Design a binder for this molecule. Structure first.
Ligand SMILES: Cn1nc(-c2ccccc2)cc1Nc1cc(O)cc(O)c1C(=O)N1Cc2cccnc2C1
Length: 207
């Protein structure tokens, strides 16, 4: 399942999307939807925000690690949610994505096919997904092109409280996406619509 699908999408997405910066639009869009979900659930059950009071998106580059992390305090995913994403959604969305592609239809927005996650492959050679839903444990899953990694209970990672954290291991020739000014421009250009705070961690540079 996952090995073939991730390999296909890695090839197709890198071939047809020359503007690699849209990966950040897709991730921010997914985070925004997850935040809409917990916001709406908290209307009828305020205690849903007990795990994490604030709703936001935070971007954390780590140049020493070569990673760009996008974390949100959205509703998160149960293990069943993540399993469904990896199985049913990935298979069906890949089919719809490449029929749209073949059709010559406007496929600019990848997430309309439910596989926007894989646009991470524009800039990343592997992604570590950490996620925490109020009804389940914290889980981690690793994605790489051709990879068959198992969803695992995360016992040694930092606690999310609630939400989802996408840690992207940036490609060697694309470290520009770790730079503060480049990230800010991309966010400004592609995320005007978002109604949640978008935060960036900037670190004093030696020097
Ligand atoms: C959209 N999506 N797709 C995959 C996927 C993974 C592998 C293979 C195929 C698909 C995973 C996700 N979830 C997320 C991706 C993010 O970047 C940020 C997030 O906060 C989530 C999240 O926790 N959400 C819960 C939720 C509830 C209601 C509406 N939207 C959401 C999104």
């Amino acid at each position: 399942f996952q090995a073939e699908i991730s390999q296909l999408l890695d090839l197709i997405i890198n071939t047809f999307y020359s503007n690699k910066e849209i990966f950040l639009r897709e991730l921010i869009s997914n985070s925004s939807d997850a935040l809409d979900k917990i916001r709406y659930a908290a209307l009828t059950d305020p205690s849903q925000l007990d795990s994490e009071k604030d709703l936001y998106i935070r971007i954390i580059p780590n140049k020493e690690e070569g990673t760009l992390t996008i974390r949100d305090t959205g509703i998160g995913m149960t293990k069943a949610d993540l399993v469904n994403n990896l199985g049913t959604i990935a298979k069906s969305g890949t089919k719809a994505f490449m029929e749209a592609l073949s059709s010559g239809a406007d496929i600019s927005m990848i997430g309309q096919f439910g596989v926007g996650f894989y646009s991470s492959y524009l800039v990343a050679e592997k992604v570590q997904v950490t996620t925490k839903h109020n009804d389940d444990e914290q889980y981690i899953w690793e994605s790489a092109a051709g990879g068959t990694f198992t969803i695992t209970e995360d016992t040694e990672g930092p606690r999310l409280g609630r939400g989802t954290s996408m840690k992207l291991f940036i490609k060697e020739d694309l470290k520009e996406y770790l730079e503060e000014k480049r990230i800010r421009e991309i966010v400004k250009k592609h995320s005007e619509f978002i109604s949640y705070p978008i935060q960036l961690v900037v670190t004093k540079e030696t020097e």
